Ligand binder design. Structure first.
Ligand SMILES: CCCCCCCCCCCCCCCC(=O)OC[C@H](COP(=O)([O-])OCC[N+](C)(C)C)OC(=O)CCCCCCCCCCCCCCC
Ligand SMILES: CCCCCCCCCCCCCCCC(=O)OC[C@H](COP(=O)([O-])OCC[N+](C)(C)C)OC(=O)CCCCCCCCCCCCCCC
Ligand SMILES: *[C@@H]1O[C@H](CO)[C@@H](O)[C@H](O)[C@H]1NC(C)=O
Ligand SMILES: *[C@@H]1O[C@H](CO)[C@@H](O)[C@H](O)[C@H]1NC(C)=O
Ligand SMILES: [Ca+2]
Ligand SMILES: [Ca+2]
Lengths: 180, 180
């Protein structure tokens, strides 16, 4: 009956876990079997690696019925390791009829090495306002962060970010914050 | 007898104090009269303004004799306000025969509003190794710093620098740290 789909594309799944196959999360508005026993499923998930700064999810409401998504919580539980996870979409919106990519960003601050715990609480509502899908209650996700080490180091009180670029202050630019 | 000159060019003097005249500091290897009573002179100097991120000094050893300069201390006494002052020259070098510009940088961190105290201790030595000129002993300089306020603010745990640019982390770019 249902028309809702949520999945990780074959390409994104390959960079993440090594297998170039679509990972189905929701098919025809029903959670995939692996997500039924969430705690068993989660214990097979390693922390997101340092080389992964963001993850692409694909979703669609493939029918004539309208669906509404809402990001209730985008929260880092280790703010000194990683800032709040981000989404490249409005927090409340319609699930698109055309399959579209939602990028979840994992902003490691670059000040500390470590594993940051975080939440991505999202609900899907039908046109009656009822919640029909949602992140499993109390779900925790993990991201591995590394301390930034820029080539040569950032001068003029500049800090190195996790993309190996110098974060330069007042009238200071260049690869190591030298120019004016 | 002396050949050493140090001064602030007319243009730099205009943006700094409002008067488009060269400010002579050292002429023919002799400190300018105003620098004799350093404490009286210093009390007429306001903290460097927020709109000034760096200052240009011009120097030359206009004769055949060689002179050597050495920056002994480039230190901020308020590290949380401003990082250590910088120079765009090697710390030990020869004073050029051709008049050349030395840029002293004042790197306000953008985290705090306030006045930062700092030191610029430099000596000039002749070819016998004797110090013939130097910053007056225990000299303190001041720079006004402002807390950075980027238009819209820096997302993804990014910080705003004092040149109103977003300092973006891991796989995050753009005007407010949004893109990947
Ligand atoms: C748009 C983003 C939404 C969704 C936002 C919530 C999650 C976003 C958080 C980002 C962090 C998640 C990454 C987890 C870390 C990781 O390494 O993932 C491991 C697995 C690798 O996949 P795997 O080892 O194969 O697991 C599946 C195996 N099968 C079943 C295919 C045989 O990858 C996975 O197993 C997939 C993990 C996704 C499971 C989360 C389920 C929550 C879904 C909420 C559904 C309700 C609302 C949406 C409905 C349209
Ligand atoms: C290359 C950088 C070196 C030099 C590095 C040391 C200093 C660098 C520190 C940066 C901060 C200094 C800025 C001071 C803040 C300020 O607002 O400056 C105010 C004055 C404005 O100028 P003014 O009000 O006219 O003062 C002179 C008035 N007259 C005499 C012309 C009538 O501007 C001035 O009065 C000029 C201030 C410079 C006085 C410092 C004297 C120390 C000189 C050391 C000499 C020894 C070694 C070099 C010899 C070649
Ligand atoms: C994620 O999706 C964006 C959107 O086009 C794409 O540019 C990027 O290459 C994708 N990344 C992966 C690992 O598939
Ligand atoms: C300082 O000197 C540099 C070197 O060319 C010049 O580009 C800059 O415009 C000068 N600034 C002032 C205020 O004179
Ligand atoms: Ca660094
Ligand atoms: Ca800001």
């Amino acid at each position: 009956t249902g028309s809702l789909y949520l999945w990780i594309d074959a390409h994104q799944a390959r960079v993440l876990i090594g297998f170039e196959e679509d990972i189905l999360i929701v098919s025809e508005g029903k959670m995939a079997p692996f997500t039924h026993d969430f705690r068993k499923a989660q214990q097979r998930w390693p922390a997101i690696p340092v080389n992964i700064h963001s993850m692409n999810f694909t979703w669609q409401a493939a029918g004539q019925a309208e669906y509404f998504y809402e990001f209730l919580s985008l929260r880092s539980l280790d703010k000194g390791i990683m800032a709040d996870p981000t989404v490249n979409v409005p927090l409340l919106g319609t699930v698109p009829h055309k399959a579209s990519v939602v990028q979840v960003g994992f902003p490691c601050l670059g000040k500390q090495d470590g594993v940051a715990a975080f939440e991505v609480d999202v609900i899907v509502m039908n046109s009656e306002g009822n919640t029909i899908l949602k992140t499993p209650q109390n779900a925790i996700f993990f991201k591995t962060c590394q301390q930034a080490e820029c080539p040569g180091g950032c001068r003029n009180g500049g800090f190195c970010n996790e993309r190996r670029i110098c974060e330069c202050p007042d009238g200071f630019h260049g690869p190591h914050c030298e120019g004016t």
